[PDB]
Design a binder for this molecule. Sequence first.
Ligand SMILES: OC[C@H]1O[C@H](O[C@H]2[C@H](O)[C@@H](O)[C@@H](O[C@H]3[C@H](O)[C@@H](O)[C@@H](O[C@H]4[C@H](O)[C@@H](O)[C@@H](O[C@H]5[C@H](O)[C@@H](O)[C@@H](O[C@H]6[C@H](O)[C@@H](O)[C@@H](O[C@H]7[C@H](O)[C@@H](O)[C@@H](O)O[C@@H]7CO)O[C@@H]6CO)O[C@@H]5CO)O[C@@H]4CO)O[C@@H]3CO)O[C@@H]2CO)[C@H](O)[C@@H](O)[C@@H]1O
Ligand SMILES: OC[C@H]1O[C@H](O[C@H]2[C@H](O)[C@@H](O)[C@@H](O[C@H]3[C@H](O)[C@@H](O)[C@@H](O[C@H]4[C@H](O)[C@@H](O)[C@@H](O[C@H]5[C@H](O)[C@@H](O)[C@@H](O[C@H]6[C@H](O)[C@@H](O)[C@@H](O[C@H]7[C@H](O)[C@@H](O)[C@@H](O)O[C@@H]7CO)O[C@@H]6CO)O[C@@H]5CO)O[C@@H]4CO)O[C@@H]3CO)O[C@@H]2CO)[C@H](O)[C@@H](O)[C@@H]1O
Ligand SMILES: OC[C@H]1O[C@H](O[C@H]2[C@H](O)[C@@H](O)[C@@H](O[C@H]3[C@H](O)[C@@H](O)[C@@H](O[C@H]4[C@H](O)[C@@H](O)[C@@H](O[C@H]5[C@H](O)[C@@H](O)[C@@H](O)O[C@@H]5CO)O[C@@H]4CO)O[C@@H]3CO)O[C@@H]2CO)[C@H](O)[C@@H](O)[C@@H]1O
Ligand SMILES: OC[C@H]1O[C@H](O[C@H]2[C@H](O)[C@@H](O)[C@@H](O[C@H]3[C@H](O)[C@@H](O)[C@@H](O[C@H]4[C@H](O)[C@@H](O)[C@@H](O[C@H]5[C@H](O)[C@@H](O)[C@@H](O)O[C@@H]5CO)O[C@@H]4CO)O[C@@H]3CO)O[C@@H]2CO)[C@H](O)[C@@H](O)[C@@H]1O
Lengths: 649, 649
Amino acid sequence: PTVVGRIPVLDVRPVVQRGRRPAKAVTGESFEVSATVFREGHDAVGANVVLRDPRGRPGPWTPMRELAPGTDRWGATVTAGETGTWSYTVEAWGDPVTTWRHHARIKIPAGLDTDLVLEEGARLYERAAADVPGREDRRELLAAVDALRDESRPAASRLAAALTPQVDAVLARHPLRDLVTSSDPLPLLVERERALYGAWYEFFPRSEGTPHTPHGTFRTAARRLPAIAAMGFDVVYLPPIHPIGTTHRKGRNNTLSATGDDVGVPWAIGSPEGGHDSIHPALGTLDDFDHFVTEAGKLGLEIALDFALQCSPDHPWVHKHPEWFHHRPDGTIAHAENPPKKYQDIYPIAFDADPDGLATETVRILRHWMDHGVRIFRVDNPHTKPVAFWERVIADINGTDPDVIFLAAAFTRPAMMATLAQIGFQQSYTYFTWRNTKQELTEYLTELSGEAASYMRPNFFANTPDILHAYLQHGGRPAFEVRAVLAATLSPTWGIYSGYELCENTPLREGSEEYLDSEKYQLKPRDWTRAAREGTTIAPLVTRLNTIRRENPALRQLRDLHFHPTDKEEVIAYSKRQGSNTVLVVVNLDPRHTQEATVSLDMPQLGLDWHESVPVRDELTGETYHWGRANYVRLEPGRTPAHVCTVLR
Amino acid sequence: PTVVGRIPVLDVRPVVQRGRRPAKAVTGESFEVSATVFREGHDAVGANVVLRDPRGRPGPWTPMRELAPGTDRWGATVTAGETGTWSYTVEAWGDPVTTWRHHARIKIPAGLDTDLVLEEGARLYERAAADVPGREDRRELLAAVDALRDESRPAASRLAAALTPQVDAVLARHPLRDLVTSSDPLPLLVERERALYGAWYEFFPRSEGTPHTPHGTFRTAARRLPAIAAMGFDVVYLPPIHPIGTTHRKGRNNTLSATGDDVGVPWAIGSPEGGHDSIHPALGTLDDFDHFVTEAGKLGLEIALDFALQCSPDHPWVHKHPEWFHHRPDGTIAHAENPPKKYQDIYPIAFDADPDGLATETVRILRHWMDHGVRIFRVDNPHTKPVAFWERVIADINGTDPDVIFLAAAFTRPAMMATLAQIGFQQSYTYFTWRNTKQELTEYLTELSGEAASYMRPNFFANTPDILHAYLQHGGRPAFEVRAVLAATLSPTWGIYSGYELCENTPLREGSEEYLDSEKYQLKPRDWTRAAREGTTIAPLVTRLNTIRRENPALRQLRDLHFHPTDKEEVIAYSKRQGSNTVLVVVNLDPRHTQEATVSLDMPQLGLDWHESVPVRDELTGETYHWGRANYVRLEPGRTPAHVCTVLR
Ligand SMILES: OC[C@H]1O[C@H](O[C@H]2[C@H](O)[C@@H](O)[C@@H](O[C@H]3[C@H](O)[C@@H](O)[C@@H](O[C@H]4[C@H](O)[C@@H](O)[C@@H](O[C@H]5[C@H](O)[C@@H](O)[C@@H](O[C@H]6[C@H](O)[C@@H](O)[C@@H](O[C@H]7[C@H](O)[C@@H](O)[C@@H](O)O[C@@H]7CO)O[C@@H]6CO)O[C@@H]5CO)O[C@@H]4CO)O[C@@H]3CO)O[C@@H]2CO)[C@H](O)[C@@H](O)[C@@H]1O
Ligand SMILES: OC[C@H]1O[C@H](O[C@H]2[C@H](O)[C@@H](O)[C@@H](O[C@H]3[C@H](O)[C@@H](O)[C@@H](O[C@H]4[C@H](O)[C@@H](O)[C@@H](O[C@H]5[C@H](O)[C@@H](O)[C@@H](O[C@H]6[C@H](O)[C@@H](O)[C@@H](O[C@H]7[C@H](O)[C@@H](O)[C@@H](O)O[C@@H]7CO)O[C@@H]6CO)O[C@@H]5CO)O[C@@H]4CO)O[C@@H]3CO)O[C@@H]2CO)[C@H](O)[C@@H](O)[C@@H]1O
Ligand SMILES: OC[C@H]1O[C@H](O[C@H]2[C@H](O)[C@@H](O)[C@@H](O[C@H]3[C@H](O)[C@@H](O)[C@@H](O[C@H]4[C@H](O)[C@@H](O)[C@@H](O[C@H]5[C@H](O)[C@@H](O)[C@@H](O)O[C@@H]5CO)O[C@@H]4CO)O[C@@H]3CO)O[C@@H]2CO)[C@H](O)[C@@H](O)[C@@H]1O
Ligand SMILES: OC[C@H]1O[C@H](O[C@H]2[C@H](O)[C@@H](O)[C@@H](O[C@H]3[C@H](O)[C@@H](O)[C@@H](O[C@H]4[C@H](O)[C@@H](O)[C@@H](O[C@H]5[C@H](O)[C@@H](O)[C@@H](O)O[C@@H]5CO)O[C@@H]4CO)O[C@@H]3CO)O[C@@H]2CO)[C@H](O)[C@@H](O)[C@@H]1O
């Protein structure tokens, strides 16, 4: 057997780890399948993509086209349907009809061997007819055969009868394919829509209490859910909801010693009251948690829980499973580190004494929360547990419950980030918060929407409890507005951490990305009613962005994204498309100064002629403009962060 | 199982068609094996390459290093030995000693838990000692253990005794490796030296005749061999040596009708006198061919025959095996084309009626010439026969005779060129003749010496019977000198077609790359004795270039090549290295005007300090210079095409 087939079809993409891991999609998502296809000699080739579903049923006829002249790189768009494990193949073939037409278009006018050329055509069309299933299609081709062979008609008329649009249609649907050659199947894992598309809101339930009981419960925190749904969110991410240790508990502002009433850090999980399968007693009971999940569900909100595989020193595991920790010669366990950050309140887990016990217990815990309606987990610090451990855990959970979504909070180096996505994490956090200039955004999004999209689905959190970027610190409310527009329009999944709406931007100190008086170490009551009354919240802009996303299918996908040039360093422009829906976005990245620029649209990329002019509506204001190849924009921080425009038809 | 191991080792390179085809090397050749290696958490990792020979014997200890900070991309140089099918693996591991040192270097000065840290070290060094085979090495590590545990000495002195250079040496050779994880083996095909390295000379034996018998024979053409060996060539490439058809024979200058004594084109193979297994009767007999091969061998010359799988209309196959040709509806066979070039003297072969018969007969023909000492074949127009056909033929021949070298004359698009090399062609022709500016040469050679070197070995013919580039047409003798220096110093395999030495550069017409009065269509006697006597040949420069190659191992490899900046568009500089041999080349690409430039050497790339100064000898002149970071050069066309300098050691 030869590696290469009769008609070479090589290096089919997407591919992940050389075919050993699936490429990714979600239901309704379109992506490009490509390949290198060519043949020996000068005759034409064709190619097509056969996408097969979980029961092996092939999809529709999907012909490919050469993507750029001279490259022999071919492509076509496919669309994923129902969830499960799919496969895709590229078929390549000699295209004798195209070859014959090209010869005939030249030889018939020149008068060179014309009876012979037309007779060659007739025999091809005869072979074409025989392979066609439809009876009226077959009759069309046989009529062209007889016209080709009618030696009483002039040569140019006999030929023209084989080149009608009615004949082209039969052959475009059922072409004559010589020497059909297949690639080996590549795997595709199709997951639910929420894995790619959704808006996320993070808050601490304990902060939403009362004057008489400052520490919030699930019952009091449920009152926040209606406002979260009104801002157009789909997922509520809760920090750890378990008991919190007392030994080495941290105080306010990440000080080493907790005082009397200090609540500690939710990530320091475990006490005598319970571990990862228990509820913090100040939050309420498991029953109260069910009522919270039920109320969320009625508002169209899914709950995502933090899963943080680590322990306070008071966690039951410390004595029940000592072999799950690394001990030093004196018996002590070294607290976790991520230098120069120290985590004196927690122990990390060791994996090499009892890997089986840890995996068994991990999937038991996840299944417990799954039984109470949690179908999404934000996995804290996945990059400090072994990569193969997560691969096992995710395969075990998704083997019985393929709807469960895991989000990797992998704030680490690129290779680990990529690997975690490739071994099965449905979503990843990204370097988004550290991409603020036009060049940084353009480069990074070109990476995320290109090759990485076959294995990674990004979740653009504009802030997190650990990340208040200098851009927001120095820019104030106009910077919050810019980052919300960017996050919501550049990824189909974005999110914010509570307080973002209020433009909370006071850092711990200069050159830090921590918040002053961080919610991680203290209760943080906020006057939501007052901020709404006084207009000192950007909640309306957040709400409008989420409504724009819900109404424009182009913003519910990742891969179709193009950047259009402007003549100002501070102004960035881009478009996204999905069927007949086109969204065009222009953002002023300067939060202090007004910017005027000329935006020069690559018009072919919008499906339009260079000289054309199209109406657009800015969905932030309701204003209509008329934009063509070159358009003046004026963007004033505080009044207009950006234009977010739909192309009107 | 999990796809990912305990310590991730991912994306090992080189790789060809995802591991389904071997990467390439030759005996004595060095190349880099690389991989992505990292682990969870902050602790250090190490890696090493295990290269295994055809009997499975592992090579020496080959530790890898991280190639650039923050990339997690690791590499090391391996060297191929004996010919055959090898394999390579990357092993990755936790490096606990490096981890412990990094902690100890900080914690011991700071005074934090010092007894505990040193006791942790002692236990690691104890584990290290146990795995070491040498008895004096083991004693060194156990002495460091006792020093680490001596609680009567100060902490900094106990530590320092574990960090001596004597201890470092033991651990660099025999490190303590945790959680050793392997990649899956990748294949490596190691071929003989000639596949990568050699100088080739093409000539037509029929042109080397006498006054009484103008059509040369093998007996008369053997008298040309001594001068070919004196120019330092290793391979003689002969155009087809078979009978030549009479039907549609071409005349002089590619005219359609041959006159009385016109000899025709060697590539129009076959007559009633025989086919591809026969000798043209005007060349002599098989016995005369054996004498020619024997005389070549005595001069250190190997013969390479053209194998051109195509037929004149008089070839016996036309009537014996009609199914080996495509016939039109009237029974005629269309002559071969490569438009707008027409080949009215030949028929192409069709492969889909009798693929088995064609492969069987093809390997029979090749084996016949192999029995008469031909171990190298130049395959004409491989890109017009199926790719899988060559894959089958090459695997069959190399399965019994792995020393046979096939050279692909694939003047075609990049994808086909690459694929032919990947399916087993030992060597390829390249786009060299169409790379003449500094930018064109720098870009193309960076491609050939980088990733393509794992599957392709280039043969730089400065001219061929079908390619006289405009650069040579317009530049005259100074241009011939430049292209010879470039070809001989940039690839370990180069060649010329006879007449290049004489600076034959008259084209068929303006804008053509054909020669006027081409040797393809006529006998071309050359007065070699007269040109040598009159100094109108660049044979001496060719001879010197080949001697320089024979004396400098850096010029007998491909992969180690670096371009150094100059401040003139017409002056190009580069270096090549192999062990302690370094060659530096500076070429003036202007054949009409003298060029003076400053050559600014990247000194670290030569293994040297920025402020250093090193003696070099120009091997073209014998002159010695002293060159550092910045060097004036003056290059005058006709006197000095280039400097070809060795670094004196
Ligand atoms: O008796 C029979 C017959 O015998 C004789 O004929 C023999 C010859 O003696 C024998 O040597 C041989 O020669 C054939 C050869 O086998 C054929 O393939 C063909 O090759 C020609 C070719 O047809 C020409 O067009 C020309 O192509 C060059 C090109 O000029 C040059 O620029 C370059 O181009 C490549 C470029 O450098 C690359 O970068 C790349 O381009 C990329 C772009 O960069 C990218 O941006 C994007 O656009 O994609 C592009 C790729 O698509 O690729 C470019 C090419 O694709 O290289 C090409 C290819 O080398 O020159 C070649 C070489 O001459 O014809 C010759 C000559 O016939 O076989 C015949 C038959 O046996 C005798 O001569 C005859 O009279 C007798 O009848
Ligand atoms: O009760 C216990 C504990 O609870 C709390 O702590 C929690 C947190 O609440 C929880 O969220 C989480 O946070 C951890 C996180 O899991 C850790 O990974 C870590 O992450 C930090 C990180 O340590 C920082 O260094 C910083 O990293 C950024 C970096 O600043 C940023 O610039 C960027 O860097 C990447 C760069 O952008 C890329 O281009 C590329 O760079 C390339 C270069 O381009 C190339 O030229 C060459 O140089 O190679 C480079 C590659 O190396 O990659 C760069 C990546 O290195 O991205 C990095 C990574 O995101 O910030 C991150 C994020 O904060 O620490 C956080 C915070 O602790 O887990 C803990 C524990 O449960 C509570 O806070 C604590 O007090 C309590 O004790
Ligand atoms: O369509 C979105 C846009 O709609 C509305 O804009 C309208 C303007 O408000 C209105 O005035 C008009 O625009 C005129 C403009 O008034 C006029 O002054 C002129 O603009 C000049 C600048 O004055 C000049 O400084 C220079 O500015 C830039 C230049 O654009 C840039 O390419 C580069 O060279 O730097 C220069 C200096 O910074 O040139 C421009 C013209 O190119 O001409 C404008 C053309 O019409 O009409 C607008 C609607 O078409 C909204 O008010 C606005 O917020 C929305 O963004
Ligand atoms: O080492 C290899 C080299 O050895 C020999 O060169 C020596 C020369 O023979 C010798 O004369 C001397 O070179 C002097 C030169 O004589 C003197 O004129 C000066 O050169 C000036 C140019 O006159 C001036 O036009 C300008 O030229 C370039 C410049 O180099 C370039 O960087 C750019 O700016 O364009 C300019 C315009 O074309 O500047 C240069 C000086 O930078 O100084 C030279 C200093 O050396 O010493 C040479 C050293 O060995 C061989 O003769 C020669 O063939 C070999 O290549």
